Amino acid sequence: GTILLDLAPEDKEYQSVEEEMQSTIREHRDGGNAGGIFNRYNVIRIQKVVNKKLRERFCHRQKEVSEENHNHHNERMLFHGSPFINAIIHKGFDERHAYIGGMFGAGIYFAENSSKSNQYVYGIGGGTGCPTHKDRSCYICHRQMLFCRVTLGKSFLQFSTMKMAHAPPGHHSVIGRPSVNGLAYAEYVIYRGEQAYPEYLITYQIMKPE
Ligand SMILES: O=C(c1cc(Cc2n[nH]c(=O)c3ccccc23)ccc1F)N1CCN(C(=O)C2CC2)CC1
Ligand SMILES: [Zn+2]
């Protein structure tokens, strides 16, 4: 059973989440087609996801990865956008639904830039936008994204497409780094659902630039 705990805006924990969300917005190559046009979000609320069973699976794997990486689990807080956010907060991430179409193959994808995750909230390339207005740039409808704890362990650096089914030998994750001819922004990939915990559930709106 998942329990959603509201965080007060005056709480330093709420402020840290909003600060990372706002500060990591960037301009995307698609000129805002997938996620919309905006320089800031309006944060509606931030809830902590509490689930004992999911936490135990996460901590158990974190100990295993720590033992395989000279006692460093290498956790990072990263964003994830998905139309299936309800299933994620109740059952956790699931590699059985890993992104077949991804540049690093069938893994679970995360971004260090909140605006890159916002491109996936309504589907691949923003699908057809919000259910109500069918607008990928809707300023009215409340969106939701996750800010997750992700166990990276020994991360495998890549610049180019390399379709994998699992992390490479001796590794626990794959990080696609930006390059002039390749990625504009980073992407973090894990191949096991228990290497991520959906810590924060952010409800927000993109704001129309003035
Ligand atoms: O990893 C994906 C996934 C990711 C993407 C890409 C993606 N999605 N979301 C992001 O924030 C992101 C950031 C950087 C680069 C790519 C992304 C597309 C379709 C997908 F199925 N999954 C889909 C949602 N997940 C689940 O376990 C759902 C509940 C069944 C986790 C696995
Ligand atoms: Zn809308």
Author numbering: 1105 to 1314
Sentences from the paper on this structure:
Poly(ADP-ribosyl) polymerases (PARPs) are a subgroup of four enzymes (PARP1, PARP2, PARP5a, and PARP5b; PARP5a and PARP5b are also known as tankyrase1 [TNKS1] and tankyrase2 [TNKS2], respectively) that continue the reaction (PARylation) to generate long chains of linear and branched poly-ADP-ribose (PAR) on target proteins. Thus, TNKS activity promotes Wnt/β-catenin pathway, and TNKSs are potential drug targets for the treatment of cancers driven by Wnt/β-catenin pathway, most notably colorectal cancers. We determined crystal structures of the catalytic domain of PARP1 and the ART domain of TNKS1 in the absence and the presence of the ligands.
Olaparib is the largest PARP1 inhibitor studied here and is the only one that extends into the adenine-binding pocket of PARP1/TNKS1. It adopts different conformations for the recognition of PARP1 and TNKS1, despite making similar interactions with the two proteins. In all structures reported here, a structural water molecule is observed (except for the olaparib-bound structures, where it is displaced by the carbonyl oxygen of the ligand; see later). Some of these conflicts can only be alleviated by major remodeling of the D-loop, specifically the base of the loop consisting of Glu1199 and Arg1200. Thus, the changes required in the D-loop conformation may not be energetically favorable. Selectivity of olaparib for PARP1 over TNKS1 is largely because of conformational energetics of the ligand.
